[PDB]
Amino acid sequence: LPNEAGRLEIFKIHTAKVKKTGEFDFEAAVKMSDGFNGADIRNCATEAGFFAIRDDRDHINPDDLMKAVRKVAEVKKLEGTIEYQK
Amino acid sequence: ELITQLDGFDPRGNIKVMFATNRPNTLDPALLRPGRIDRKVEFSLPDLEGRANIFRIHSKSMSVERGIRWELISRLCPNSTGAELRSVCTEAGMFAIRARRKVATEKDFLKAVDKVISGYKKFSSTSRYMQYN
Amino acid sequence: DRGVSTFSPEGRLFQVEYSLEAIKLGSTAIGIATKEGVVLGVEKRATSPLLESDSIEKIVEIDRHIGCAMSGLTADARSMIEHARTAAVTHNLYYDEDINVESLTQSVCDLALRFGEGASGEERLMSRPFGVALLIAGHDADDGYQLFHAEPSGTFYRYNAKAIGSGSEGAQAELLNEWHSSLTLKEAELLVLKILKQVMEEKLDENNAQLSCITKQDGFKIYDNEKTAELIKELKEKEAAE
Amino acid sequence: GYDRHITIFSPEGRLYQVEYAFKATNQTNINSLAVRGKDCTVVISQKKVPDKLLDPTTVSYIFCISRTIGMVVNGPIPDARNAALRAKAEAAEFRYKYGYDMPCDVLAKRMANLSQIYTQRAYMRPLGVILTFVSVDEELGPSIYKTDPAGYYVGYKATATGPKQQEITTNLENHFKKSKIDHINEESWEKVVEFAITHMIDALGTEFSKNDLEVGVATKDKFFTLSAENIEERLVAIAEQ
Amino acid sequence: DSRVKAMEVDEKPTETYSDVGGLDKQIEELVEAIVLPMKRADKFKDMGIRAPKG
Amino acid sequence: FRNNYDGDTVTFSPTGRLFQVEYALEAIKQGSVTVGLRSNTHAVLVALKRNADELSSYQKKIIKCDEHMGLSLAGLAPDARVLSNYLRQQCNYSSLVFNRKLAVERAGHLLCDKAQKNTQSYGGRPYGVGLLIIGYDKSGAHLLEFQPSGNVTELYGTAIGARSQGAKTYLERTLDTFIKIDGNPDELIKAGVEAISQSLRDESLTVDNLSIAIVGKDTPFTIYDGEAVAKYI
Amino acid sequence: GYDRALSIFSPDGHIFQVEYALEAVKRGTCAVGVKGKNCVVLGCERRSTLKLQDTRITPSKVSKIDSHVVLSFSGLNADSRILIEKARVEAQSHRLTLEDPVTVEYLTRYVAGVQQRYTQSGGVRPFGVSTLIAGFDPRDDEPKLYQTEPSGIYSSWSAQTIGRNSKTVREFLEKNYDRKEPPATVEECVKLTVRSLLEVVQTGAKNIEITVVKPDSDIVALSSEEINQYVTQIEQEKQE
Amino acid sequence: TGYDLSNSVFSPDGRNFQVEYAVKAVENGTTSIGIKCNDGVVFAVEKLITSKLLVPQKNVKIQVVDRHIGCVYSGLIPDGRHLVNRGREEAASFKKLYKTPIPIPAFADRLGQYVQAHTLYNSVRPFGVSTIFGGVDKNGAHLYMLEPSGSYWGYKGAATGKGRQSAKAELEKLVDHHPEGLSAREAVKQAAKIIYLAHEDNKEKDFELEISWCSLSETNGLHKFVKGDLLQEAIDFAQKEIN
Amino acid sequence: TNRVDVLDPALLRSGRLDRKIEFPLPSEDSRAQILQIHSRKMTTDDDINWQELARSTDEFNGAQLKAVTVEAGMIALRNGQSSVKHEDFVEGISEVQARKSKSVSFYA
Amino acid sequence: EKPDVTYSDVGGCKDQIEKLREVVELPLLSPERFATLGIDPPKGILLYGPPGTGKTLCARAVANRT
Numbered sequence A: 001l002p003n004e005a006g007r008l009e010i011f012k013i014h015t016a017k018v019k020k021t022g023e024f025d026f027e028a029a030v031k032m033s034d035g036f037n038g039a040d041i042r043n044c045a046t047e048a049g050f051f052a053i054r055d056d057r058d059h060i061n062p063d064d065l066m067k068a069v070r071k072v073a074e075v076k077k078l079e080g081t082i083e084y085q086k
Numbered sequence B: 001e002l003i004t005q006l007d008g009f010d011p012r013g014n015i016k017v018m019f020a021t022n023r024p025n026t027l028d029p030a031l032l033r034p035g036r037i038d039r040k041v042e043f044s045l046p047d048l049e050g051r052a053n054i055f056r057i058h059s060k061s062m063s064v065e066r067g068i069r070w071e072l073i074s075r076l077c078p079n080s081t082g083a084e085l086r087s088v089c090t091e092a093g094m095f096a097i098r099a100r101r102k103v104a105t106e107k108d109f110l111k112a113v114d115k116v117i118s119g120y121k122k123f124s125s126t127s128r129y130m131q132y133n
Numbered sequence C: 001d002r003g004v005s006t007f008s009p010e011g012r013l014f015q016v017e018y019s020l021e022a023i024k025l026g027s028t029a030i031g032i033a034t035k036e037g038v039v040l041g042v043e044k045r046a047t048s049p050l051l052e053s054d055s056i057e058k059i060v061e062i063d064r065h066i067g068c069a070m071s072g073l074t075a076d077a078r079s080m081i082e083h084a085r086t087a088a089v090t091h092n093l094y095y096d097e098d099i100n101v102e103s104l105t106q107s108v109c110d111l112a113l114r115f116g117e118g119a120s121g122e123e124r125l126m127s128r129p130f131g132v133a134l135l136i137a138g139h140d141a142d143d144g145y146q147l148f149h150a151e152p153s154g155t156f157y158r159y160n161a162k163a164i165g166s167g168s169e170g171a172q173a174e175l176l177n178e179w180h181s182s183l184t185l186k187e188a189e190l191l192v193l194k195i196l197k198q199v200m201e202e203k204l205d206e207n208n209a210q211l212s213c214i215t216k217q218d219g220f221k222i223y224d225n226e227k228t229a230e231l232i233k234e235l236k237e238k239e240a241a242e
Numbered sequence D: 001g002y003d004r005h006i007t008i009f010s011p012e013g014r015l016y017q018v019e020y021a022f023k024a025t026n027q028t029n030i031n032s033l034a035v036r037g038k039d040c041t042v043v044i045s046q047k048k049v050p051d052k053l054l055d056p057t058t059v060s061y062i063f064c065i066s067r068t069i070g071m072v073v074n075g076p077i078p079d080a081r082n083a084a085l086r087a088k089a090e091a092a093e094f095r096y097k098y099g100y101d102m103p104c105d106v107l108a109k110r111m112a113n114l115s116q117i118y119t120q121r122a123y124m125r126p127l128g129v130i131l132t133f134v135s136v137d138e139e140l141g142p143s144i145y146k147t148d149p150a151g152y153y154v155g156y157k158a159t160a161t162g163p164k165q166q167e168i169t170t171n172l173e174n175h176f177k178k179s180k181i182d183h184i185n186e187e188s189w190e191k192v193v194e195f196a197i198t199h200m201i202d203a204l205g206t207e208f209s210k211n212d213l214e215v216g217v218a219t220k221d222k223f224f225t226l227s228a229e230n231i232e233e234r235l236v237a238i239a240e241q
Numbered sequence E: 001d002s003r004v005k006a007m008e009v010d011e012k013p014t015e016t017y018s019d020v021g022g023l024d025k026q027i028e029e030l031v032e033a034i035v036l037p038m039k040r041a042d043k044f045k046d047m048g049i050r051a052p053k054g
Numbered sequence F: 001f002r003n004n005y006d007g008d009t010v011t012f013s014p015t016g017r018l019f020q021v022e023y024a025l026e027a028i029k030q031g032s033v034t035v036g037l038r039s040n041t042h043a044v045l046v047a048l049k050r051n052a053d054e055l056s057s058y059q060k061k062i063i064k065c066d067e068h069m070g071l072s073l074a075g076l077a078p079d080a081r082v083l084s085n086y087l088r089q090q091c092n093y094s095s096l097v098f099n100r101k102l103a104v105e106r107a108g109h110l111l112c113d114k115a116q117k118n119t120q121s122y123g124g125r126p127y128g129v130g131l132l133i134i135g136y137d138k139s140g141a142h143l144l145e146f147q148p149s150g151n152v153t154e155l156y157g158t159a160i161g162a163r164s165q166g167a168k169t170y171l172e173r174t175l176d177t178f179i180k181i182d183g184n185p186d187e188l189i190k191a192g193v194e195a196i197s198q199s200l201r202d203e204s205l206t207v208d209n210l211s212i213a214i215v216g217k218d219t220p221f222t223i224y225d226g227e228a229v230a231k232y233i
Numbered sequence G: 001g002y003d004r005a006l007s008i009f010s011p012d013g014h015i016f017q018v019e020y021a022l023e024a025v026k027r028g029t030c031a032v033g034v035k036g037k038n039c040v041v042l043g044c045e046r047r048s049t050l051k052l053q054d055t056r057i058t059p060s061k062v063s064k065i066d067s068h069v070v071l072s073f074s075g076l077n078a079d080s081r082i083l084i085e086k087a088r089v090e091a092q093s094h095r096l097t098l099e100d101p102v103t104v105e106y107l108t109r110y111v112a113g114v115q116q117r118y119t120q121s122g123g124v125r126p127f128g129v130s131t132l133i134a135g136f137d138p139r140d141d142e143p144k145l146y147q148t149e150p151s152g153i154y155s156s157w158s159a160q161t162i163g164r165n166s167k168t169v170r171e172f173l174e175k176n177y178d179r180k181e182p183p184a185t186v187e188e189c190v191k192l193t194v195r196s197l198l199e200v201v202q203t204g205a206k207n208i209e210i211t212v213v214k215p216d217s218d219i220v221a222l223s224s225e226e227i228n229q230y231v232t233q234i235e236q237e238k239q240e
Numbered sequence H: 001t002g003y004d005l006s007n008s009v010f011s012p013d014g015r016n017f018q019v020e021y022a023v024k025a026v027e028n029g030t031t032s033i034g035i036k037c038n039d040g041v042v043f044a045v046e047k048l049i050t051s052k053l054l055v056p057q058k059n060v061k062i063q064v065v066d067r068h069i070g071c072v073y074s075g076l077i078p079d080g081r082h083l084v085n086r087g088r089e090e091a092a093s094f095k096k097l098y099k100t101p102i103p104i105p106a107f108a109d110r111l112g113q114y115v116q117a118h119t120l121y122n123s124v125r126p127f128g129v130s131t132i133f134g135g136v137d138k139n140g141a142h143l144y145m146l147e148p149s150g151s152y153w154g155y156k157g158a159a160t161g162k163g164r165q166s167a168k169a170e171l172e173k174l175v176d177h178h179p180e181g182l183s184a185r186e187a188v189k190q191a192a193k194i195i196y197l198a199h200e201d202n203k204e205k206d207f208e209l210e211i212s213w214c215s216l217s218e219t220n221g222l223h224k225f226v227k228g229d230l231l232q233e234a235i236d237f238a239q240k241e242i243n
Numbered sequence I: 001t002n003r004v005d006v007l008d009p010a011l012l013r014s015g016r017l018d019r020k021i022e023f024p025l026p027s028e029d030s031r032a033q034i035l036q037i038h039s040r041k042m043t044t045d046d047d048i049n050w051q052e053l054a055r056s057t058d059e060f061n062g063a064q065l066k067a068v069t070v071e072a073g074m075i076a077l078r079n080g081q082s083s084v085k086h087e088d089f090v091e092g093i094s095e096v097q098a099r100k101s102k103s104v105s106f107y108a
Numbered sequence J: 001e002k003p004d005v006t007y008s009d010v011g012g013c014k015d016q017i018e019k020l021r022e023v024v025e026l027p028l029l030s031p032e033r034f035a036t037l038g039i040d041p042p043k044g045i046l047l048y049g050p051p052g053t054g055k056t057l058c059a060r061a062v063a064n065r066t
């Protein structure tokens, strides 16, 4: 699983592609994000984008990112326990 | 597969379904709730008046004297299933054939009730299975 | 495996509910309460001819003004009757007056629930409740003659006449038709002996049936076998008068 | 069925339930490293504060048992506090009944014995923490003892625990393979900390800000944890080398 | 396969969202995830995000 | 039909509920109806008793706890016979030591915490009775509803037992009339009899089947019975 | 503590630990009781399958509780001694505090009350023993003969039998024992109890034990010779 | 299989299922927030009005401990009312022996052991309650939250109950705009704003707002209730913005 | 699916089943809405106050609430009435419950 | 091929017999009465009880009738 160091590179690959109002909260998000797979960060930008559809915004605010991180995390952890490697 | 055709993704045809089990304990919560098993009906041990009517439904073919007080031997029979009552009448007719008598008497019915409940209270299916209920 | 405290999905303690069926297996107790006294009738139900039928006991004195009848597994009632004499006696020691019937009955009902698995120092003195039900009869000056049915349910009702035991269903059908407030003490005796014969599984005679009354004047008295023989001869007469 | 819930042997011959406790340890993602100085002991461990809302000061894995004894815990924090509170009581009681300070060894041996009684009774559950005690004992010098739920404990020249403990073991071994002594030698306690952090950056690969570490140091007759200001001084010393 | 062809839409009887009682927040969240990326597919393409897959 | 988490009280279900405490709450829905309601000067309990059969008498339903506090049960009789005995003693323990009439609100919590400690521990049947506890102290009239879960709450009026819902509906309408009837104890009892007639499944009120109890600014807790409730049907 | 509720009601309304206890009493050796005009006679089955077993020092089936109350038993030999210890205790306790030896009916009521207690105490299994308590009240010569059982209920009998093959022995006693007229003397009664036993023992003079208890504290055990004589007479009488 | 039936058993993973289950029982309760201001703490709890019979302003779900520790919880209401009750012994007892009002980091520790003990035997059920409790002693304000597992942490805002998603997201924005540490007098009006926002997923059954505060500089470090005007002003403030 | 704890992690996780939508039991107010869309199909009256019936049913599924409507008509038919009345909706809640002993004056 | 164990053989006049008839027999016999109310008839019955209580006996009885 990405380390605390890498996890930061992965975020910056999926927020560049998408529109934004300029996002400086990846310093906070990475620290909140534990056990996130590559796959969950990419989904995190999407959930942030789906709060942007409800507000009728057309940019991902840094507030919408704080909400999305928490939302992916709550359901992930609960419902699936990912494997322990050898 | 069975669960999925009793709610379909479509209305299914005119199909009534009857389930008969010796334990509801076993059954899954998906089978039990209404829309797939609407009405639960319990067939339980008959009370005293039940055991009087079920003696009348086995005995009416039998030749018995007029002085049989079926209330007397239903009162003497403890809490019993309808499957013990068949064996009661069979054994009443049995002691009459051993005795060389064509008609079953009051003495013979008491012996039979004694024999069925005494021995087979050791082998009663009723006690274990009533607890799973 | 279930504990002993567990509720069913209906909200009933398993053991306490099951216990009621142990009473159905017991022998017949009949109780008719009048304004002159209460009559207690029992089917002794000897099990052999060798069994001496006089040593069997199902009626017992609690105090000179309270008597008791038992139905069910009757060795449990050895423990209930011992508590009762103490409450009744200890209560005459502290307050110089005989208990009420209604108060004595309630003390034996409190005792009844005491089953459990133990927690801290607290006594739990059974594993399952008393497998016996009682018809407590008695008389105080305050409310005349009374008759109570105390069940292991932990609830007691005051009755005008109740019958428990093997022949409970068919016995209480006859009472509902025959009882009214204007029975005397000598009509109730023949009325118990008539109902005792309809639900009895033997021949009615003086050896295997017992009568008992409770009057203010004479206290609680168990009839000897001689007196009961006269009342048995007096039943056959009123049925041949017709 | 009822041989794998409680602590009785299985038909094979192993205490399953105890074995299940060790998998409960690596459920916090803390890594720790602990080295013997020449007159001191140094123990660093990562300190991840997940949410912005948590107050960063209260989250801690380093517990002051006495002046003499520090203690760094790997595992779930409820059982942390439960083992730290029992440790403190034994540390006080010892002092009272024998009149000197409890040595490191004797606190370690008292925990292994409570841990044993917990895998032998049926209704008790073994606590899921691994405890490491650092001290500068007065008789034996610098010491580290690491205790575990089974109730086994042993001395250590240096030690690591956590999810990525294997990486950190290889480094701590490579160093004592080249120098051929049992303990890092440098009189000052300040430079044993600088060495410590270097081996964590290698073993985990992670670069550490001053907040990601929490540092504890046992010298003679006092054990402290370094303030958030002091951990920033250390990391300027790694950058300037 | 012929079983795939029988699985296609034969038309499921008009329920309407009015005959799903209660459950308001659940309906909203489903139509966000399934319905929109089909019909409103231009508003996701400009935003840059990929479309939820299921 | 019996679940897998129906053993002791310790067990939680994967839904999160505690099943044994829910089963004891069904013990209330099979007891007999009972209606409580209060104004700002009088509390009133109206209980419909229950005979066993014809020859039988009626089963007490209203317990005088003191001379300013009384409760009515619906559910198992021996469970209440422990909880009513316990409040009696706790009301004496206040008059003895602090010379204070035990405030109704504080007696609710005391009862609650006694129910809780039997669902925490292994063994210990949970109490299968629902009480209504009325009373008049220094802060006015009070009426409490005590669940076997332990949760006690303060209400202008409630009911419990079989088919209570028909009465609880009549109290939600008329709440704004009977709450303002102050300094008139007759009319407040009248509104309570009408409530419980909505819950009957044609059992018919009778002078031996009904039991009323009131308590107020000036009256002691008193129970009416037999001939005394003939005026109020 | 250990307090599991070993004994609970089943939904049929019988305690299953008590029915199981009473089946255990069936496999037990056979003991018979018959009371004559003014004696009791307790006859017991000795398992004689065993060989090379000394009879001088081996505990008998009749254990004296007092000097006028004897007790016999069927069931588990080990558990039986536990009743007899509490009984010998109870007989001296009652002499101490009220004076006067125990009356047979009271000594039973105590013993029967112990078997009942162990059917409610959590953690205890029921007893596997049924007893015949016999003897003479002090200053009286009415014979008394009682039977207890692991339900805890006790009853007096004119004759009784517990243990294996009891239905066959009881049938013989319902025909050969007139309820009105007891065996005339002590000698006729012994001849009625031996003759009942010889149906289910299928003879063996050594197998049968007879203890007679008479009024006024006279307990005697009939010796082997006496028993043999009686058996030979009955066999020869019946044979003739 | 059989690892879920009982407490204080571990699965092959390393989890206490009874303890995982208890968090689902916390999850059903009502929304409850706690805001650490600069000078103290502000507790605020949504109390659902179930029916027109429940009496207004009379069922306080904020229980005080000593004279300076507020406790507000969500989950199983009787079970919380027991965990506080035990907590009134631990405080009154410390105060007897050391004659100083018990400090807040120490009170957090006592409660912790007590809840941690109830995950160690088969014989006792784990507590089904999340607590938020805090106050002011001579070392400053603290705020704590006690999981039913037995862990607790420091906090600058906390949440529990159904509205824990929207709340914890709103307390982040409250610590963003006001990094200095907002004023205690103002935080009454900000706590109200966080209950009305977290009550839009629950707007079915109206509610009644309860607020209490403990500040060094307003009430002398003694825990009171907000009542009268300052509370009637709070309702106004939050209600005007979310229009 | 109704067992989500069982499915392994390759079938779940974001990027496969992105959204994970939970279904709660109908709340006390929803029960009122639910009972009212199933009853339109059969005969109604103004006797019925659906508000009452919604408070009675605790932890009823949206499947059991549809059963209450159906069962209540079965009792209206057995009497032989023109239309469903309020008694029968009350009486029907007790038929969906597996209750089958009532109060044998086991409870005071 | 539908055996015959007539309905008389079922014990008593139990309620249990009458709850089966409302599910199976009535909507086939008389769909006139169900049309007016608008009720759609139930479908599932669960017969459960200790062995020997005549779960099967009724099944055979409704097998010919229906």
Ligand SMILES: Nc1ncnc2c1ncn2[C@@H]1O[C@H](COP(=O)(O)OP(=O)(O)OP(=O)(O)O)[C@@H](O)[C@H]1O
Pocket: B003, B007, B030, B035, E019, E020, E021, E022, E023, I001, I002, I026, I034, I061, I062, I063, I064, I066
């Ligand atoms: N919220 C609701 N509003 C209205 N009707 C409902 C509601 N929920 C369920 N129903 C009724 O219940 C019936 C059965 O529901 P359904 O078959 O969806 O159960 P399910 O949740 O899919 O169960 P499973 O666990 O087998 O998937 C539906 O046909 C519908 O009429």
Ligand SMILES: Nc1ncnc2c1ncn2[C@@H]1O[C@H](COP(=O)(O)OP(=O)(O)OP(=O)(O)O)[C@@H](O)[C@H]1O
Pocket: B022, B054, B057, B082, B083, B086, J009, J010, J011, J050, J051, J052, J053, J054, J055, J056, J057, J058
């Ligand atoms: N209610 C009853 N009335 C008359 N006879 C009955 C009744 N119940 C059972 N019997 C008799 O008992 C016999 C066995 O019953 P049946 O085959 O129905 O058992 P069951 O109820 O299916 O239980 P199981 O399936 O466990 O054997 C029947 O053939 C019948 O003769």
Ligand SMILES: [Mg+2]
Pocket: J055, J056
């Ligand atoms: Mg069958």
